[PDB]
Nucleic acid binder design. Structure first.
Ligand SMILES: [Mg+2]
Ligand SMILES: [Mg+2]
Ligand SMILES: [Mg+2]
Ligand SMILES: [Mg+2]
Ligand SMILES: [Mg+2]
Ligand SMILES: [Mg+2]
Ligand SMILES: [Mg+2]
Ligand SMILES: [Mg+2]
Ligand SMILES: [Mg+2]
Ligand SMILES: [Mg+2]
Ligand SMILES: [Mg+2]
Ligand SMILES: [Mg+2]
Ligand SMILES: [Mg+2]
Ligand SMILES: [Mg+2]
Ligand SMILES: [Mg+2]
Ligand SMILES: [Mg+2]
Ligand SMILES: [Mg+2]
Ligand SMILES: [Mg+2]
Ligand SMILES: [Mg+2]
Ligand SMILES: [Mg+2]
Ligand SMILES: [Mg+2]
Ligand SMILES: [Mg+2]
Ligand SMILES: [Mg+2]
Ligand SMILES: [Mg+2]
Ligand SMILES: [Mg+2]
Ligand SMILES: [Mg+2]
Ligand SMILES: [Mg+2]
Ligand SMILES: [Mg+2]
Ligand SMILES: [Mg+2]
Ligand SMILES: [Mg+2]
Ligand SMILES: [Mg+2]
Ligand SMILES: [Mg+2]
Ligand SMILES: [Mg+2]
Ligand SMILES: [Mg+2]
Ligand SMILES: [Mg+2]
Ligand SMILES: [Mg+2]
Ligand SMILES: [Mg+2]
Ligand SMILES: [Mg+2]
Ligand SMILES: [Mg+2]
Ligand SMILES: [Mg+2]
Ligand SMILES: [Mg+2]
Ligand SMILES: [Mg+2]
Ligand SMILES: [Mg+2]
Ligand SMILES: [Mg+2]
Ligand SMILES: [Mg+2]
Ligand SMILES: [Mg+2]
Ligand SMILES: [Mg+2]
Ligand SMILES: [Mg+2]
Ligand SMILES: [Mg+2]
Ligand SMILES: [Mg+2]
Ligand SMILES: [Mg+2]
Ligand SMILES: [Mg+2]
Ligand SMILES: [Mg+2]
Ligand SMILES: [Mg+2]
Ligand SMILES: [Mg+2]
Ligand SMILES: [Mg+2]
Ligand SMILES: [Mg+2]
Ligand SMILES: [Mg+2]
Ligand SMILES: [Mg+2]
Ligand SMILES: [Mg+2]
Ligand SMILES: [Mg+2]
Ligand SMILES: [Mg+2]
Ligand SMILES: [Mg+2]
Ligand SMILES: [Mg+2]
Ligand SMILES: [Mg+2]
Ligand SMILES: [Mg+2]
Ligand SMILES: [Zn+2]
Lengths: 87, 103, 50, 135, 50, 119, 70
RNA sequence: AAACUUUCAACAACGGAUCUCUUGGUUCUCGCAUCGAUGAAGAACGCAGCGAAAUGCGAUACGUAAUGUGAAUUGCAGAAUUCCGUGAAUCAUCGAAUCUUUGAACGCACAUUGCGCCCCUUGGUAUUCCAGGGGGCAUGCCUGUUUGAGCGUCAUUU
RNA sequence: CGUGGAGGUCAGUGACGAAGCCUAGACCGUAAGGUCGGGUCGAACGGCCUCUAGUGCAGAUCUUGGUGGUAGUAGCAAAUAUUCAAAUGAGAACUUUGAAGACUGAAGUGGGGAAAGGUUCCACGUCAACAGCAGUUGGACGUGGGUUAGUCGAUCCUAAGAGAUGGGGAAGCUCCGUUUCAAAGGCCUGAUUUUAUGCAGGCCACCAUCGAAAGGGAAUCCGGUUAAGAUUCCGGAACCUGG
RNA sequence: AUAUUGGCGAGAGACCGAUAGCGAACAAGUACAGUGAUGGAAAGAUGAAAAGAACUUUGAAAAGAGAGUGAAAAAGUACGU
C-alpha cells in the first residue's frame, strides 16, 4: 500500500501562502518560501532558471511607480505646471 | 537561438513502447509527453538553425567591377540590346541619346 | 475548514465572486470576442490549493 | 590558506582539482580587511588601507574611509571624485590599492594577460571577427 | 581522423566559439556615426582644426 | 454637472469642508436609493465631486504648508523635489564646479586659445 | 427587513475595518438614534454586516423608512 | 435475385488540409541613459450605473487636478447644457495630488487581519481606566549636539 | 522535372472570376511532370532569362493532428429487496405523497466533531452538458439567501524545537552561539506643589521572540425561535474581568 | 575612439506566415499539473454591412418545413476556401 491507500493520508500542508510572493510555497516548518526566498533579505532566483526569472521579473507586474519614470525624464523632471494659452 | 529548446525534456528511454525522441515532463497539459527539440518535432528546433554569420556580402575585384560597368555602358549604345532589354526606344532620334546640358 | 483564518476566509470570498457566468451584455460590445467565461471554477473539478 | 570549503574533503572530479589543503586565495588578506569594514560603514567610501600589525593567527589593517555625503569632502575639489556614483565600493571591485595589485594591472610584458583586465583581454582574443567583405 | 594528402589544419574551434562571434553589420552604420560627429565636433570647435 | 475645480478654489477652507459633508450626505442618499431602483448613474458624479473637493482642499492645505516653509533650509520631504534617488544625491552645481586653487590660477593664465589655420 | 419589523434592528453593511464601537458612534451620529447592542459578522462575500438593535425609545422601522428603504 | 463485401461517380457527412490573409514573431541598424528608505521590483484584497476576465486604477479606486484638442462616449443606460463654451471625450499631454494590505520593509509579531510603547487631541467623573481622531518608536554607519563612564589621565584648591 | 523567396522582362492572366480544390473527361512528355475542359470557388497570380534556399517523403517503435477495423462487441453481475397506487409532468422502473415488504441493528446506514474542502448549506427556477440505463431528481445549471458571542475557540502560556541581539567564523550567499568573554533596565514612589511631573530615597533583574483551534487556561445556563444561524438571536435567570 | 540576447524611443529585411515565427498573432507564463523547486498547452479568418432569418406552420422543446436577409446561405455566430 505504498500507493493508493497511503495517498488517503495526505491532508497536512507542507506549504502555505507566502506573504511576499503569494504562492502556496511558504514552508511552515522551515518558515521560509521555496519560490521567492522570503523571509530572506533577498529574493530567491537562480541563473539556471531563465523561465523562473522571466515569470517574475519587472514588467510582469503593474510597475506602479517605475512605469512613469521614462516619461518624467523625457520632460526633464519638470517642476511646476502647464500654463494655459490665450483666446 | 533559443527557439525549440525552452524545455527540460528528456528521452523516456526505450521499453516504453514509444520512439526515443526527448519528451516534455510533468502532467496536466497536452504539452506533457510531446516530442521535443529536433526537426521532426512539432515545436522543436529547426535543422541547422539559420545563423547571422552567414556570408551576406560578396567581395568583387575592383577591376572586374570596372570592366563590368564598362561593358554595361558600351551596351547602352547598342539599339539591339536596348530594345531586347525591353526599353521602347523604337522611335528615338539616335543612340547614344545626347540631350542639351539645359536638362 | 471549520475555524478558518481570515486570510483564507478572504481568499475564499474573492474566489466565489469570481465564480459566475459572463455578464451577458458584454457580448453586445463592439468587436467583443468573448462568448463565455473561460476561467469558471467548480469545487469538485479543480482545487484552489489554499 | 583557503581550505577548500568542501564536504569531507570530497572533490568529486578529476584528480587535479582534488586538492583541498594547499590552495591560496587570489586576493590579499588586506583586500579582505578593506572589504569588511567597507561593508560595515557602507555609507563611507574606501580610499585606501595599510598593514599595522600581525600575529600568527591574525593580520591587522587600518582602513582609510571617506564620507562622500559630508560637504567638507563634496566641496574639496581634490576629493569630490570619490563622491561620484562610479566609485561605490571600489574595494569590492579591486579598484583600491590592494585590488589593482592582486588584479595584476601594470604595463609591460609581464602583465600581458591582466592589465586590460584578465577576462576582458581573454574574451577579446577569443572572439571571431567577421567583416562584410570577408578578410 | 586523418586521411588523403592534405595540409594539416589547425582551426581552433573547440571552445563554444559561437558564443563570442562579432559580425560587423554596423560597418556602414558606424561610418555614418563616425562622420556625424566629426562634422559636429568641427562645428563646436569653432575655426580650430580638429 | 458636479462641482468644478475653479469654483472650489475661491471657496474657504471651512466652506469646502462643509461642501464635502454635503456631498458625503447626498452620496449616502443615493446609495440607499440605488437599492430600490434599477441603475443610478447619477451617483457617479457625486462620487467624483467628492474627489474634486478633497483634491482642492489639499491643494490649499499643502500650499499653506508649502508657503510657511518658503526660504527655510529644511522643507518637509513631501515638498522636496522627487526627481530620482540618484539625481538627488548627485553633487550640486556648486560642489561640481569647485576647482582647486592651483587650477584656478592655471586656467586663467593658459586658457583654450581659439585659433585658425590658413594665413 | 424582518429583523426590523420585529426585532428593532437596523442592518447595515458596515466597513470591513470598522469595529463595534465605531459602528455604534456612526449609527448614532448619522441617524440620531440610540444603540443597545451591536453584533457584527463578515459576510462570506467579503463585506461586513452589522446587526444593530436600537433602544425601545426608538422604532427601527420608523427610522428606516425615515432613512428611505423598505 | 437480394442482403453483404469491394470499386468508381454525384450529392450529403466526418475532419480541417490547401489557397489567400496577418495590429504577431524573428534578425539587422540608428538615437538615448532614467529603479529604490521622497518605500523600488514584486505580492494580496479591493475599486465601474449594469464586469467574470484582460487592461487601468487605490477608500478621491476603469480614476481626482493641470494643460492641449474641440464634440463626443456608445452594449444599454444615462447624462450633460457646457456644443461661438474654464468645455464632450474610455481622447491626447501630464508638470499637481490620491496612492488599501504588503514587499529591501522599519514598534514586536505574522499558518494571528495577533500584541506593545510615546506625544497631541475628542468624548465617558479620569494625569493613571475605556473608546474615537491625528502624529510617532528598525538596524549599521558618518558629521555634529546633548548627557555620561574609566586612579586612562592633567591641573588645581587649603 | 518541381517548390518558397529575389533582380530583369512579357506594358503577361484576373471580380466578364486570381489562387485553391474536385473530376474510371481530353492532350503533350520514356519520365520527374506539363497543358486543357467541366464543377466548386472568390483576390489574387503566371511564363521566360537570372539570383537564392529552412526546396521534393512511405517508412525513422519518427512529430502533431485527424480517422478506421476491432464493435453495437468486452462489458454496465461485490455490498439480502423490492411491490401497489395517487400526484406532477410532453414524457414516470428511477421525482413527490400514501401504503406494503425489508435493511443498517447503536462496535449504526444514528447523533456531532478534528484535519481537509470552500458554499457543496437554504430557497426559487430548472435539464444543454455531467450523475457510464433514465431523469420532471441532484453535491449539476441559473438566480438569490444565509454564518450575530465579555462567557465557544483562537488571542495568553510554556513543550520538543524554532530564532533576532553584543559577538565569533566565512571570499560571500551566510555559519555558529541564546546568556552566550556585552556598559543589555523597568517599577514602587515622595519631592516639587514655576508643574502632574526633571528630581530624590531606592530594592529587584546570568533577561528577545516565535512554537499547542487535543497540553496549561478568568467567567453561561435553561426555554423559545429560522427556508437555512445560534452555549452567538429572543425571553428569563447568572457569572468573570477591568475601571 | 570600445562593449552591449537588458531598459526607453525609432528605421529596416531576398526572415516566418498560425504543426511556421517567441512558449504565447487570442482574457499566455493564461488554463491545467505538482507538497515544493518547477512544468506548461490548446486556441486567428460569417458578411461591405447583422441586413444574426420578421412572419406562418409542425413540435414538449431542440429543431424541421416554408418565408425573409444578402452579390452569395454552395457565407446561418457549428459560420471563407
Ligand atoms: Mg501522517
Ligand atoms: Mg513536515
Ligand atoms: Mg525580511
Ligand atoms: Mg518552432
Ligand atoms: Mg476550528
Ligand atoms: Mg476530491
Ligand atoms: Mg489559478
Ligand atoms: Mg567537482
Ligand atoms: Mg584534467
Ligand atoms: Mg592542478
Ligand atoms: Mg587606492
Ligand atoms: Mg595569456
Ligand atoms: Mg577562434
Ligand atoms: Mg571538443
Ligand atoms: Mg551587435
Ligand atoms: Mg583626431
Ligand atoms: Mg464575530
Ligand atoms: Mg462532400
Ligand atoms: Mg496557409
Ligand atoms: Mg518586422
Ligand atoms: Mg498581505
Ligand atoms: Mg455660447
Ligand atoms: Mg486617501
Ligand atoms: Mg519585521
Ligand atoms: Mg497589524
Ligand atoms: Mg485629530
Ligand atoms: Mg558621536
Ligand atoms: Mg528547375
Ligand atoms: Mg522550367
Ligand atoms: Mg520557384
Ligand atoms: Mg522559405
Ligand atoms: Mg479519384
Ligand atoms: Mg478558378
Ligand atoms: Mg474577399
Ligand atoms: Mg535558376
Ligand atoms: Mg528540410
Ligand atoms: Mg507521410
Ligand atoms: Mg508507413
Ligand atoms: Mg448502442
Ligand atoms: Mg454484451
Ligand atoms: Mg465483472
Ligand atoms: Mg447488490
Ligand atoms: Mg407503480
Ligand atoms: Mg428502482
Ligand atoms: Mg435486521
Ligand atoms: Mg455488534
Ligand atoms: Mg431544486
Ligand atoms: Mg447518464
Ligand atoms: Mg439523459
Ligand atoms: Mg445553485
Ligand atoms: Mg541564529
Ligand atoms: Mg506564543
Ligand atoms: Mg474559555
Ligand atoms: Mg435551542
Ligand atoms: Mg468588580
Ligand atoms: Mg518602440
Ligand atoms: Mg504557434
Ligand atoms: Mg504540420
Ligand atoms: Mg506552441
Ligand atoms: Mg515538473
Ligand atoms: Mg476570411
Ligand atoms: Mg475557419
Ligand atoms: Mg427554426
Ligand atoms: Mg459563391
Ligand atoms: Mg462562402
Ligand atoms: Mg443564426
Ligand atoms: Zn514567496
Amino acid at each position: 500500500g505504498k500507493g493508493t491507500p497511503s495517498f488517503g493520508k495526505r491532508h497536512n500542508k507542507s506549504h502555505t501562502l507566502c506573504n511576499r510572493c503569494g504562492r502556496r510555497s511558504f514552508h511552515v516548518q522551515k518558515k521560509t518560501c521555496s519560490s521567492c526566498g522570503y523571509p530572506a533579505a533577498k529574493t530567491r532566483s537562480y541563473n539556471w532558471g531563465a523561465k523562473a526569472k522571466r515569470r517574475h521579473t519587472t514588467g510582469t507586474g503593474r510597475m506602479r511607480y517605475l512605469k512613469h519614470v521614462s516619461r518624467r525624464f523625457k520632460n526633464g523632471f519638470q517642476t511646476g505646471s502647464a500654463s494655459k494659452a490665450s483666446a | 537561438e533559443k527557439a525549440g529548446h525552452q524545455t527540460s525534456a528528456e528521452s523516456w528511454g526505450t521499453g516504453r513502447a514509444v520512439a526515443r525522441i526527448p519528451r516534455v515532463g510533468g502532467g496536466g497539459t497536452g504539452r506533457s509527453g510531446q516530442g521535443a527539440f529536433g526537426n521532426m518535432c512539432r515545436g522543436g528546433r529547426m535543422f541547422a538553425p539559420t545563423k547571422t554569420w552567414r556570408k551576406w556580402n560578396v567581395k568583387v575585384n575592383h577591376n572586374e567591377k570596372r570592366y563590368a560597368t564598362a561593358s554595361a555602358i558600351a551596351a547602352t549604345a547598342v539599339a539591339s540590346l536596348v530594345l531586347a532589354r525591353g526599353h521602347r526606344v523604337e522611335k528615338i532620334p539616335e543612340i547614344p541619346l545626347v540631350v542639351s546640358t539645359d536638362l | 475548514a471549520a475555524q478558518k483564518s481570515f486570510r483564507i476566509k478572504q481568499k475564499m470570498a474573492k474566489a466565489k465572486k469570481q465564480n459566475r457566468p459572463l455578464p451577458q451584455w458584454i457580448r453586445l460590445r463592439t468587436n467583443n470576442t468573448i462568448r463565455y467565461n473561460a476561467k469558471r471554477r467548480n469545487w469538485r473539478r479543480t482545487k484552489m490549493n489554499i | 590558506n583557503r581550505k577548500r570549503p568542501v564536504p569531507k574533503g570530497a572533490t568529486y572530479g578529476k584528480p587535479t582539482n582534488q586538492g583541498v589543503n594547499e590552495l591560496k586565495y587570489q586576493r590579499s588578506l588586506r583586500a579582505t580587511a578593506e572589504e569588511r569594514v567597507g561593508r560595515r560603514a557602507a555609507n563611507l567610501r574606501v580610499l585606501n588601507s595599510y598593514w599595522v600589525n600581525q600575529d600568527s593567527t591574525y593580520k591587522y589593517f587600518e582602513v582609510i574611509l571617506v564620507d562622500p555625503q559630508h560637504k567638507a569632502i563634496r566641496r574639496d575639489a581634490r576629493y569630490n571624485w570619490i563622491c561620484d556614483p562610479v566609485h561605490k565600493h571600489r574595494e569590492a571591485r579591486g579598484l583600491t590599492a590592494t585590488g589593482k595589485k592582486s588584479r595584476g594591472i601594470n604595463k609591460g610584458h609581464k602583465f600581458n594577460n591582466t592589465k586590460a583586465g584578465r577576462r576582458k583581454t581573454w574574451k577579446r582574443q577569443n572572439t571571431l571577427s567577421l567583416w562584410r567583405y570577408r578578410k | 581522423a586523418i586521411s588523403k594528402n592534405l595540409p594539416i589544419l589547425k582551426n581552433h574551434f573547440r571552445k563554444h566559439w559561437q558564443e563570442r562571434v562579432k559580425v560587423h553589420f554596423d560597418q556602414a552604420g558606424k561610418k555614418v556615426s563616425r562622420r556625424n560627429a566629426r562634422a559636429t565636433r568641427a562645428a563646436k570647435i569653432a575655426p580650430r582644426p580638429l | 454637472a458636479g462641482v468644478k475645480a475653479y469654483e472650489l478654489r475661491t471657496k474657504s477652507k471651512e466652506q469646502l469642508a462643509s461642501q464635502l459633508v454635503d456631498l458625503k450626505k447626498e452620496l449616502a442618499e443615493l446609495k440607499v436609493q440605488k437599492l430600490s431602483r434599477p441603475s443610478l448613474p447619477k451617483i457617479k458624479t457625486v462620487r467624483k465631486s467628492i474627489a474634486c473637493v478633497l483634491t482642492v482642499i489639499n491643494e490649499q492645505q499643502r500650499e499653506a504648508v508649502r508657503q510657511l516653509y518658503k526660504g527655510k533650509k529644511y522643507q518637509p520631504k513631501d515638498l522636496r523635489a522627487k526627481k530620482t534617488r540618484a539625481l538627488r544625491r548627485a553633487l550640486t552645481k556648486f560642489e561640481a564646479s569647485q576647482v582647486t586653487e592651483k587650477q584656478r590660477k592655471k586656467q586663467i593664465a593658459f586658457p583654450q586659445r581659439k585659433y585658425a589655420i590658413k594665413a | 427587513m424582518k429583523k426590523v419589523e420585529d426585532g428593532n434592528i437596523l442592518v447595515f453593511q458596515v466597513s470591513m475595518k470598522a469595529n463595534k464601537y465605531q459602528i455604534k458612534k456612526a449609527v448614532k451620529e448619522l441617524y440620531e438614534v440610540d444603540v443597545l447592542k451591536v453584533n457584527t459578522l463578515v459576510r462570506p462575500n467579503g463585506t461586513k454586516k452589522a446587526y444593530v438593535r436600537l433602544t425601545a425609545d426608538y422604532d427601527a422601522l420608523d427610522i428606516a423608512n425615515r432613512i428611505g428603504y423598505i
